[PDB]
Structure formats: C-alpha cells, structure tokens
Amino acid sequence: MISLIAALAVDRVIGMENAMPWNLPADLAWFKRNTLNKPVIMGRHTWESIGRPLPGRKNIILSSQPGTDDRVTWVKSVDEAIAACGDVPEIMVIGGGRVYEQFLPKAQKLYLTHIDAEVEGDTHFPDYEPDDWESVFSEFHDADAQNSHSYCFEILERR
Ligand SMILES: NC(=O)c1ccc[n+]([C@@H]2O[C@H](COP(=O)([O-])OP(=O)(O)OC[C@H]3O[C@@H](n4cnc5c(N)ncnc54)[C@H](OP(=O)(O)O)[C@@H]3O)[C@@H](O)[C@H]2O)c1
Ligand SMILES: Nc1nc(=O)c2nc(CNc3ccc(C(=O)N[C@@H](CCC(=O)O)C(=O)O)cc3)cnc2[nH]1
Ligand SMILES: [Mn+2]
Numbered sequence: 001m002i003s004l005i006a007a008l009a010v011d012r013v014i015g016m017e018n019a020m021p022w023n024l025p026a027d028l029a030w031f032k033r034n035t036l037n038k039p040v041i042m043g044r045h046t047w048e049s050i051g052r053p054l055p056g057r058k059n060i061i062l063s064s065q066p067g068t069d070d071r072v073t074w075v076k077s078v079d080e081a082i083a084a085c086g087d088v089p090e091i092m093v094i095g096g097g098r099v100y101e102q103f104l105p106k107a108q109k110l111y112l113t114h115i116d117a118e119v120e121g122d123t124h125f126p127d128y129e130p131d132d133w134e135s136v137f138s139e140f141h142d143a144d145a146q147n148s149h150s151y152c153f154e155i156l157e158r159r
Helices: 025-035 045-048 078-084 096-105
Strands: 002-008 013-015 037-045 058-062 073-075 091-093 107-115 133-141 151-159
Touching: 002 013, 002 096, 025 045, 025 107, 025 151, 037 045, 037 078, 037 107, 045 058, 058 078, 058 091, 078 096, 091 096
Parallel strands: 002 091, 002 107, 037 058, 037 091, 058 073
Antiparallel strands: 107 151, 133 151
16 A cells, blocks of 8 residues: 655645755654654655655655665656565655655555644645545644644545
C-alpha cells in the first residue's frame, strides 16, 4: 500500500523557498513515528531541504538526473520508485508538492497534519477530492511552550 504523509499550513501551503518556515517538534515526532522502518520516497528538492539521509528508513530519491550520493537510492520514475521499495506492507511518500501530486491517485492512506499557521508559501499539497476519503483518526493539540501553533493529526483512508 502507498501512503502520503504531509504537514499543511493554511491554504494547503507546505513550503517556501525549499524550507518549512514553522517549527513543530510534536509533528516531526509524529512523522518519525509513522515513517520509521519503512521506505520513504521523496523528490530531489525535498532531499536537498532535509539535507541528509533519514536514519532507520530506506531513502528513495526521485530525479531525472543521475544520483549524487550513494547513501540513498536514486530512481528516475514513479514506477521505479515503487519497485525499489520491494515487497513491504506500507510505502511512505514524503513529498514535496510535485511528488505528492503524482502519488495521490495511487495512495490508499493520507497522514495529514493541519497546522494553524498563516504562511506565504510557494508549494502546496495537491487539491484532493474530499468525497474519496474517510477520516479514521483525528487528534487536536493546542500550542504549548515547544509548539508555536495548534495542530491536528488526521489519518484519511480512501473509501
Ligand atoms: N510540509 C511538508 O509536509 C513537506 C514535505 C515535503 C516537502 N516539502 C516542501 O515542499 C518543497 C519541495 O517540493 P517541490 O514540489 O518543489 O519539489 P519535490 O517534489 O520535492 O521534488 C521535485 C523534483 O523531484 C524530481 N522528480 C520528481 N518527479 C519525478 C518523476 N516522476 N520522475 C523522475 N524524477 C522526478 C525532479 O528532480 P529533477 O529536477 O532532478 O529531475 C523534480 O525537480 C519544499 O519547500 C519542501 O520544504 C514540504
Ligand atoms: N507531518 C509531517 N511533518 C513534516 O514536517 C514533514 N516533513 C517532510 C519533509 N521534511 C522533513 C524535514 C526534516 C525531517 C526530520 O529531521 N525528521 C526527523 C525527526 C527528528 C525528531 O524526531 O525530532 C526524523 O528522524 O524523522 C523530516 C522531514 C515530509 N513530511 C512531513 N510530514
Ligand atoms: Mn470502503
């Protein structure tokens, strides 16, 4: 099965100038929890924004160009990316915008964090049809001393 995981600010903004302007340790812990010991697929720009391999995960990078780092796996198409994951129960697609758009039609599950932040971005999560999805988990958290915005963890499954 293919799953997308993403954190969305207001108006589905997910990035600006190849960074995530906010800082929510609780959300990154949620990301780690849900991706550890699974393959993660990302686009080249997201790979460059993270800046190093994610430990405890098979890192698969999509690029039309040859690889530049043998600590991770490089692939040249969506189908190759999926194949490189091997026979696993769950493949995690971790962005960015252009990668999300391509994998969304193939995905069975969305792990979404809705962040109460107004950020002017240049990258958005794709505009998905709500009728195709059912919410099976929702958990809201107020801002605290560590997390500067309120946020909601949601898991959607394709109906
Ligand atoms: N808030 C979140 O949850 C979240 C998560 C991830 C990323 N981001 C943010 O999203 C932004 C980056 O997203 P982005 O849309 O600009 O770029 P991206 O999706 O991360 O990567 C785009 C690149 O992936 C490569 N590639 C993509 N699709 C391919 C395909 N079908 N076949 C072969 N190669 C392919 C291309 O690399 P080449 O040009 O080398 O061919 C393309 O330029 C950043 O701001 C980042 O911080 C946010
Ligand atoms: N929900 C969600 N939040 C995110 O911020 C997020 N970010 C990306 C891509 N960007 C990044 C940037 C940094 C790290 C990162 O340093 N992760 C650490 C967490 C460290 C910790 O647990 O405190 C990791 O090991 O996973 C991951 C993804 C993709 N999906 C996401 N999904
Ligand atoms: Mn059903």
